[model samples]
Target: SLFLIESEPSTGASVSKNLTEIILIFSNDINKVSQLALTDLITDSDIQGIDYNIEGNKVIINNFSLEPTCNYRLSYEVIDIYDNHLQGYIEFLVNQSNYPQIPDQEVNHTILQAFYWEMNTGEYATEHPEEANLWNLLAERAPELAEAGFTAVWLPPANKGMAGIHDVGYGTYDLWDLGEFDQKGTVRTKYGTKGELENAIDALHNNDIKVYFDAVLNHRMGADYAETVLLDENSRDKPGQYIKAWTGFNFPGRNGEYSNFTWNGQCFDGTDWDDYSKESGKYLFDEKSWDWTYNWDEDYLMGADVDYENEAVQNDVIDWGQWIINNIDFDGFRLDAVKHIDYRFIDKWMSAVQNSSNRDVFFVGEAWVEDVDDLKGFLDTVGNPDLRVFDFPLRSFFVDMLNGAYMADLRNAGLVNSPGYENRAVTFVDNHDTDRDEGSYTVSIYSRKYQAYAYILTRAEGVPTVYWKDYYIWEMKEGLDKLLTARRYYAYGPGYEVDNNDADIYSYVRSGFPDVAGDGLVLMISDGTSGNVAGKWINSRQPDTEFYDLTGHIKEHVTTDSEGYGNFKVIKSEDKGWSIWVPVE
Candidate 1:
């Protein structure tokens, strides 16, 4: 006997508006489709102009038309050669917009990483001594930061963690309790009250600066109680005996305030520590395979690992996606810990929120992988241009250059230089994750931080990101503001990398967007012992157009020739600085 195993639009999918074909897979070979019916689930009427075919063990629906913000149901009956039959119905909602598409490639968009590691230690005013809250700090600085040119601010995870105000939001406890509930030893998160977070976003928005909520969707910590389950021994991808673990999540403190759903061992693939025996092991509920991630060193990360395959788990998270968007009205999401989670779930969650809001929002992931190809694969697997990744490869390149790596092959460096990954790579030198004394991939370029900032800001391939610590914490505001001035005012259009054999210097030119005349600029960087000059073309300039370093680093100016090429200057100092030359008129 044969039966329906799976469908392309699954049972409860939010599908594409331009979807044409419906695919159904059966266990055994299907000889023919006995009957096929399609209906508009909302209107309770039969859909017309549809045809289907029986292809071996599967049936395919063709010539189908779908509309946005509607529900559809497709019913089918199939027969095998032996007269065994199966009948089923597949229902899905088509509320998805024309999203999960590639995002804008202008490359001028700049995101600010708004938190540093070791930010808040504990509860109340003692934690954030300088200000009452972290959110208020951002709110107060929003106008100045916006003046320094930021398209968006990537705020820390607003969710309440197990460690409460001490936890930097990664130790996710309650996604619904955004400092509003007294569950995690305090009523507020490290970032302060939910109202403050909203107000911070409020001030940023007034400057047209989009705000992204840092989302911790991979796993949850600090469960309510212990439950007995077949725990995996050593996580050897096999079966094991029963054990009591802290896998129960009843959300006791905020009980049923937003959701009534409770989690248990069924909801998770595994947990790192067992609360019953008070011992630590690679404890997973039996027969559950580890989720795919970049670490690939046993996917069960710290705390309780959520199982994306679990239906109720998927349903609640998808629902949470809807609720978060409705409540915060955030412009985008900064997906955290993607390497420990599933891309399929990531895609689904992003699409869910995008459709619910029906407005364009940004999405960037922090996979933290070294290989550009690996990042490309992650983005490719997600199948959305909206999902930009932090360019770890580029950061590595910066580290290499700073650590005295040969720069002649500089054209071949970074995700920004990689073809097809231009817009998808969100370039950064360092962030709270890096640049920490606790030492987790601390790839901070100590020698030439300013030069790295110039390289990321003036380049066309990826969007540049500035760390709030660099701007405020470490007080590199003057250098960063100068780079951002050029980035905001002059950086535009297609960039062309100049080929040279000089390992001490790297140079490029922006052809300038045709609509904005004289907006083009040539950028150059010098790691040499002395100053260097490189020839580049600013194609939008008129012949004999005079230009000077907008960054005010070089006293000299470059004048364009008849063919619109200029000799760009890069000054060498104790810090090894870079230059961006914009047209004077």
Candidate 2:
């Protein structure tokens, strides 16, 4: 005569260790509980001593006390006033300390950086709101991206930034909101709503593409309240005067929907400015100082700098990480501003998130350092061994090439060429920061970006990331499309560099494999400013085969000699001047 209704910790969601009680509801007013049990999901054994209290149809489970474990299943059988029986269980997880085991990654996975800085700037969003919305646009572009041979797409921060619609997500405000709340002066993020993001993720997964979320964990901004606290104005470590720092983060819009944790002055170590008094200095809290290993790893860059060592902050963030991995159905996370956060925290947080969710999450962080050694140290510091980073050193090498570095400078110039880093280094031609044409980060590779892409795409040293700005905004789509096609079709096996002995010429021969029909290629890149230069001979590894330039710049085909070597030419004019010569059938 009575039925069980919805309850807190509903069914299969992960709950925090801080949660002491959960409520159970029944259709009937009065209820008699027959049995109650708590079983561990990991070991399938009962967790002892779970007690309860009853108030009409509402049942509160508390006295047993919360503890650390992978998860548990709470089930109960009750008799209603009408003598009807009902039973159900909720599967939940406590904070875990164990780490996840990542499986061997499949080879030849290409990634696409799916958003540019000005993605929401054009009249596109104004004219077609839904169509031009970032998430919906990404959904529509998923099929085309997969068709373009990209295995993964790295999305910008899905969480609502402080500036909301105007923010590009760098100035992070809310992690749980994801445009679901009316915070930050807007309902939707510059991208779109949580629904749109989820739908787009489905669309991408449907096309067999992995979605990687960009996570901003370094700092927090746009606080709801400014509390008075002692501040250190100068780089000097001495304690400074008192001022109102904007550190209170209640997230009133979220209203403890997913997490109940709130932030105060104790939550962060520093703030860029004081809200009450219009100040412009790096205001650090007492006993707080910007610190890390390398000189470049400054903790206080912008906003209210997150103190990773704080216990409450750590647990809350880890809790959110667990929720994110499970809730969003994502394959990877791109940690923004990694250098600004403590590496030890990243290690523990990653371990907890993965272990708690039982999900094999791929991780890459933007640790923008100059030297490859610095990056290698950071990677080993986190100790994931499997964690990845973008090839900033290689990017510098690209800029050097554009400004007259030797052709051979591309070899062993970055983490991609470092020992045991082939799988860990993610190389990119240009990204949002560099393409923004702004100070410090801006640099134009122009037409020659293809040379950088060609090098990354063909070599077995690293996975290549195609910038969305280059492919879509800069109108290099056709060139990028052809190169991507070439990469999948013939850029396989170990590529051997051919000695052209010219500062402007770099050539390589790829050894073909039997699995795919056209697994090998002859690649030639000419950075010569002069036009109409003759190309040099390079090993093709395919005897007597006629090779066709896949870039479609040159019409003639070259036949390989008995030694399996052929002459490849690249025109260094209007085009990027890179040729992928595939064996003619």
Candidate 3:
């Protein structure tokens, strides 16, 4: 039983940009140790021209320059003094410029919803229609996305879907087949091939944009096998009660490549099919009272709802999560249908994955509820405050505001308003669900989506996320780029309310902070008939400093007074109105 005691640029260490040496500390004395090399995980090759030396418990590699924003793995084989042959590896990331040393402490965070709904490019014809070569296409756009002030891209599910190449990726089939096997009648998913996905990740990382992989753990679809049984008529009333049914999975295409674990009915809490009757409706397995499996709180959404309580299911899911991190080098995850999965298991799963990798992996659960309290409770149930959840409340709040709710209500719009949990909120206006054809969750004020973007992008609260369709399909690239630029540079400091929220207009100011570019910013938005100009005294922090309106809607420059205060007027058209004021650098 060997263990990693320590290392110089230790595992998950954020080191200086000019690091040239790799060091590892072992738990035991070494003898006859050989086979040492530093491998670049990104390139999947050994770093050339590096020499290794051993000194007692320390293994040192010399003569390599670590590149910026890349991943490297150190591997070595050693013989302990006891003559036990041991192999070990350490993974580390090189620091990128202008970013916080630690991800948690990062104040300015921007996420891009990089994929659109029903975006089928058919990059490989017959692999599936209505599917784009999303991976390769996104790879080409990495530079533009980075330039747009996006720090991360929320990628759609990359695993094989039961619908094969046509899957929008939600119907998860094989967790291990990331376009590596001939599963679901094709070797590649709707996105692209495994190599293309890898290229996209590399391109994004090269541009300093992190990757957030979407993880669906609530259920499994397209099970490889099924069992037949009869369910008690009263089984729906029971929780954790299992029914005899078919819910088995064996990835024949993968043939046990990374994991050979198969799923049976016992491993699942409920299923939609019964082999005996060939029925098609959700049925909780009859193992328990059926009461504990799917209940009022956890709705049976789709496919085979995994019983997280089952140890085999838990172990396999956790293993696959770590495997993803180890293979793809994703920075974080956007967990799907979190509310449907038992909340406590989320805590355990994240703990296991993070511990195994020794990485500060960010986890944001999609507990999509309109109530802030419900979302907060889910977060609490997880037990890790760092385990953030999406701001569905705020997203819905934006919809309400656009639908004639007073703009003044914006002040209390979300969980970000709660003390100590602002960092835990990932804010967004629209997503793939909201953009679906004739979707029920469509944005209320479609023409004023930018107003929503302005509010989220310029505020000093939750990390703002921009949707993919909004950026590309709507031709909002330039405007979104400007807003994101303001966020990255000028949108710092505690936001101060500058105007009493009115039915028509709402305003806020971010007082200047030395660390941020241009010191600070003042933002104003209006949703009323006829063009309007709203006046407010904003705290600019720089007395008598000249300021410019970045949004161009307000064309005039305003000078501040001696008290770092400025009487600024934001004027815009009747249909769509928003203004951003930042100090002249």
Best candidate according to TM-score: 2
Cα lDDT listed for each candidate = 0.76, 0.77, 0.75
**Per-residue lDDT for 6-36 in model 2, tens only?**
7787654435567778788888865578988
Worst 10 residues of 3 by lDDT: 288-297
Deviation (Å) of 118 in candidate 3:
1.3
Q: Write the per-residue lDDT of candidate 1 for residues 447-551, one digit (tens) a residue.
A: 778878888888777788999778876778766776786777667777777665376777777766766645667877767655444444444344677776655
| RMSD in Å for all candidates | 28.1, 24.0, 20.5
Candidate 1: 10-residue stretch with minimal lDDT: 95-104
- Candidate 2 TM-score to native: 0.78
lDDT of 2: 0.77
Model 3 alpha-carbon miss at residue 2, Å:
81
How many pairs of residues in model 1 come into backbone collision? 0
TM-score of every candidate: 0.77, 0.78, 0.77
Candidate 3 lDDT tens digits, 399-483? 7765555788888788777677788888888888876555555554476677888999988887888988777766677567657
**What lDDT score goes with residue 306 in model 1?**
92
